């Protein structure tokens, strides 16, 4: 009962720092405009760092889509999955509120909300988020698959660079959600909810798709009883 | 029987995502033009992520030149190599078509086709593509060599950064093909095939040179008794 | 013992040399070079790969703290004697000032400029900046403590790269606010060399509180030594 | 004997081929500035990932020195023989010049320019520039020796990445002063081809001294090899 409390708190604190660091690095600084790579690196090294410190303790989901994917694959429980999703949403909003307080009334701007950019249709954007989240779930599972043992190597860095890869592309299209908590956090704080469902339907479908493809298509288990 | 089907499917899906993520990051130029480093990182972390996710299930070739190199020292049969190459070509075109469908209308432009740049000669570009793929194949052979030391496991990041290294140079000339599928995918969708042979002869020759140099010159692998037989029977 | 004595001397010398090279490389790469002004990512990579390289090269000799805040976090957390912590902090402060003085005598007077001093930026306030420095150093110690946690024996992992990228992560954000300190020696070094002590306490109070918070959170909240023999 | 052995031939050839590919890729990615001038980070990454890739691919065959300074550092740290060290230095110098001549041929005359020669920049003094190169190569040799230290447990690829990121780190600083050499072969290769030898000694004394300094500090001061058996027994009880 105590280990479970530590895991839910860790998921909360992890999502707090990820959203706090991610958005804060994505704000429009006029003296040094953030590059697609700069933002991608911030989100990328963010997940890699948080996976290293807490991955072995709770799994370092830091993402409701990852938690849902883990719910379809990993022997996680619906109770923990709910407590995790709840912890991620609380940590994210807490990270966005903390950043808002410290960010002045000049940089804040859109507070790096994920927003449909370069017009683009919701169907085209929702399709990207699906493929963006799918590749992350495939990597996370392969990097953490116990059947591989210690053979996968650099788990934190691979997962981290996988998030960065999505961002290196996603920034230009949407912003690279891959995480409903990272999307909801600035939307609640700075009132902006333009097609928010896109950043929810996409990732959730992409995560379940990646989980089913991995756990039951690409590398399924042997037959049970 | 199933494992082979899963492996061929993985090679298809891997090349799809690589081309989808790679080209999409190399075009898209509004008021944020992608830099050489930005593009190199996109292709590099792409392969690295896909080698990590699918390496243990198929080998994550994602490259016909890599599949050809593995035909000499990866224990890959010509049957698997063919099924892999076919899966890579289908995945790439599928990745470019999927990207094409979603592209923001009149944005595609070249669609990040590998193209001769800065008035250089076709011979100079084909020489680069050879060296770009030779160093990659050299790195893949060592990274997948049981005798390379360390502990069991494949370094997906090392392989990924090898692809990125090639882009830091190839981009200035072409786009760092190293992969005939990465070149054909946007060439088929758009229709631009200007000097398409450069993006095929270069990588294939560079890969075979690196594969022969590693398995016969640099670090000749340990032959099994059964493999050593075919050498004696091949002579006789 | 005798060989036990030298080992400690090697550790103190390594902590000195590590902080010297870190400050020398970090500040030198952060200077406003006219032909190529460094970007936030460019600077983040210089400080990031700096710690990662020094942790890789010297971690197995001294622990490669290169930071008084992490040394203090190890006192409450990875419980180390105050003797080593003092010798380490002293070695870091001497190496840092030596690294900033060496760079000064290495850079042309014209390009020297602000010598990459930590300074309040974008008209920020001391209270907001001290809060940022806290969260920046907290995530670094959290990563260090987990990457070097005795309980993480078997597989070596990637502590150097993870810690290195953890420093870079703090720079991708901290640079815009304070230039990212996370280290009282990196802040004091250019302040002593080039007299600029504007809000120096921010670069000291912030990191130290963030490090102790991260050390207490890890050793007492996140993954403590379970007092009960049950597990 | 060590000379007439396949392993020695493979190691000398590996050092040649490694320096060939490193110089070819390194200079070519750092000089190609037509309508897209490379940034300091871009150049640092090219040289960094260059060394990292070659150490991964060839490290197990020859040690992947790719540098006469590194080769000398291993000589000082009692590993490689003086015979092998000489053959390695010769292989590195031959590979480098071959890489620059090949790049010249493939690079259009309009963009070749100075061919990314290592040069004292922003009117730096010979004493200050030689001091930077010293500290640049010193940290690298410290990382290389630790990345190749059998006593340090590591996962596959990380040592090559650590060495790679060490080279990048050097370039992130050295570029502003000298263009970052750390390698006499990387400096000599374009100097012979293009013909610019102004104060070439800075790019040789600096790295050579930095490598020996780092090697002596590591093998004798910081982390010497033969320690004692019974200090571990005294740590126990």
Author numbering:
A (entry chain B): 6 to 230
B (entry chain C): 6 to 241
C (entry chain D): 2 to 232
D (entry chain A): 2 to 238
Manuscript excerpt for this entry:
Aquaporins are water channels found in the cell membrane, where they allow the passage of water molecules in and out of the cells. In the kidney collecting duct, arginine vasopressin-dependent trafficking of aquaporin-2 (AQP2) fine-tunes reabsorption of water from pre-urine, allowing precise regulation of the final urine volume. Point mutations in the gene for AQP2 may disturb this process and lead to nephrogenic diabetes insipidus (NDI), whereby patients void large volumes of highly hypo-osmotic urine.
T125M and T126M are located in extracellular loop C, immediately downstream to an N-glycosylation site at Asn 123. It seems plausible that, similar to N123Q, also this mutant is kept in the Golgi, after which it may be degraded via ESCRT-dependent targeting to lysosomes or the more recently identified Endosome and Golgi-associated degradation (EGAD) pathway. Overall, T126M gave crystals which diffracted to highest resolution, (~3–3.3 Å), followed by T125M (~3.7–4 Å). The T125M and T126M-structures are highly similar to wild-type AQP2, with root-mean-square deviations (RMSD) of 0.942 Å (929 Cα-atoms) for T125M and 0.322 (940 Cα-atoms) for T126M. In the T125M structure, a minor displacement of the main chain could be observed around Asn 123 and Ser 124 (1–2 Å), most likely due to the larger methionine side chain. It thus seems that AQP2 can accommodate the replacement of a small polar residue with a larger hydrophobic one without any significant structural rearrangements. It should be mentioned that, in particular for T125M, the resolution is not high enough to reliably obtain information about interactions between residues and that there may be minor structural alterations regarding side-chain conformations and hydrogen bonds that we are not able to ascertain.
